[PDB]
């Protein structure tokens, strides 16, 4: 859906920006600094779930740019694995949120955060 590689870069950066917001805005809740409303968190994680599927289709072949490292494309199998795993960690978070289980929420949130960092260490320019 992108006329030029620039448009794919713009898309993925926007998607990752929204993900970051929908993930990070839960940080105070996980830490107990803000109250836990199970229904609020369930709805937010549903949005996160939808958003977390979007960036990967905008790293199509030839869409080098931004702060993407070229290894995303020279090591495609490995990159796919990392996004697939990340999305599996999101499923765990959805399950926690759907169950209304604050302990499972905290644990799953940490695993998601680690998955974010893991990809960035391999595939995002500093």
Binding site: residue ranges?
12-13, 67, 116, 119-120
Binder to a copy of itself among 4, 32, 36, 47 (CB under 8 A)?
47
CB–CB of 108/57 below 8 Å? no
**Which region among 32-40, 82-90, 94-102, 103-111 touches ligand HEC (by CB under 6 A)?**
82-90
94-97 contact pairs (CB < 8 A, 24+): 94/45, 94/46, 94/49, 97/38, 97/41, 97/42, 97/44, 97/45, 97/46
Query: Toward a copy of itself, which CB reaches closer, 57 or 118?
Result: 57
Query: Toward a copy of itself, which CB reaches closer, 13 or 94?
Result: 13
**Which region among 13-21, 25-33, 36-44, 94-102 touches ligand HEC (by CB under 6 A)?**
13-21
């Amino acid at each position: 859906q992108f006329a030029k590689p620039e448009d794919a870069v713009k898309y993925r950066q926007s998607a990752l920006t929204l993900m970051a917001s929908h993930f990070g805005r839960m940080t105070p809740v996980v830490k107990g600094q803000a109250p836990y409303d199970a229904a609020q968190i369930k709805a937010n994680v549903e949005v996160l779930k939808t958003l977390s599927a979007l960036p990967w289709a905008a790293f199509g072949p030839g869409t080098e740019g931004g702060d993407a490292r070229p290894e995303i494309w020279s090591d495609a199998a490995s990159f796919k694995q990392k996004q697939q795993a990340f999305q599996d960690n999101i499923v765990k978070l959805s399950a926690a949120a759907d169950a209304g289980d604050l302990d499972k929420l905290r644990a799953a949130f940490g695993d998601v955060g680690a998955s974010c960092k893991a990809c960035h260490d391999a595939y995002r320019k500093k």
